[PDB]
Design a protein around this nucleic acid. Structure first.
Length: 151
DNA sequence: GCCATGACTAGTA
DNA sequence: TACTAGCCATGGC
C-alpha cells in the first residue's frame, strides 16, 4: 500500500487515478496491479465499450468502501445494477440501497464518489427528467451519457 | 449526538 | 414553470 500516481489520456482529457497496491483510491478528471488494472478498464470503456464487462473491475482501496454505510451500498449498488448505457433515478437507487425515502442522501453519496466513470454516478438522474449535476462539470455528464448512446 | 447541509421530491398556483 | 415544506445520511464540533 504505497499509493502512486498514474495519469492517462481520455477523450475527456487527462485523468489522474491514484491508489495503492491494495486498491484504487481515486480517479480525478483534471483539466501496482489495481491502477494498471483500472487503466485497462478505462481505455476499454472508452475505446472498447463493446465488451466492458470483459474487463475486471479493480479493488477499491478507499475509506468509503472499507467501512459500512449508506454511501457504501449506494456506490456499490451503483456499479452492480446500473450497467453501461442504463440510467437510474437518485430515488430509484436509494431503493436499491435500502432506504427509498432517502434520495437526497444518495446525493451526498454521489458527490462522495471517488471513482467516477468506474462507478457511474453519471447514469444517476433527477426524477424530474432533468439530468442533474456532476462534480467535474456538467459538460462531462453530457459526453458520458452521450457516448453511452443518448441524445 | 444535535443541528445545519445539499447533486432530491412530489405537490400546488 | 417556480416556491415549498417534507425527507436524509453526512460532517462538524
Amino acid at each position: 500500500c504505497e499509493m502512486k500516481r498514474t495519469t492517462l489520456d481520455s477523450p475527456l482529457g487527462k485523468l489522474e487515478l491514484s491508489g495503492c497496491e491494495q486498491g484504487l483510491h481515486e480517479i480525478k478528471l483534471l483539466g501496482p496491479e489495481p491502477l494498471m488494472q483500472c487503466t485497462a478498464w478505462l481505455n476499454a470503456y472508452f475505446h472498447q465499450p463493446e465488451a466492458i464487462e470483459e474487463f475486471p473491475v479493480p479493488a477499491l482501496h478507499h475509506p468509503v468502501f472499507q467501512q459500512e454505510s449508506f454511501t457504501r451500498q449506494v456506490l456499490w449498488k451503483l456499479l452492480k445494477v446500473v450497467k453501461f448505457g442504463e440510467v437510474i433515478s437518485y430515488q430509484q437507487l436509494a431503493a436499491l440501497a435500502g432506504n427509498p425515502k432517502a434520495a437526497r442522501a444518495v446525493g451526498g453519496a454521489m458527490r462522495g464518489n471517488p471513482v467516477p466513470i468506474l462507478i457511474p454516478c453519471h447514469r444517476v438522474v433527477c426524477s424530474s427528467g432533468a439530468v442533474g449535476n456532476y462534480s467535474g462539470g456538467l459538460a462531462v455528464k453530457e459526453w458520458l451519457l452521450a457516448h453511452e448512446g443518448h441524445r
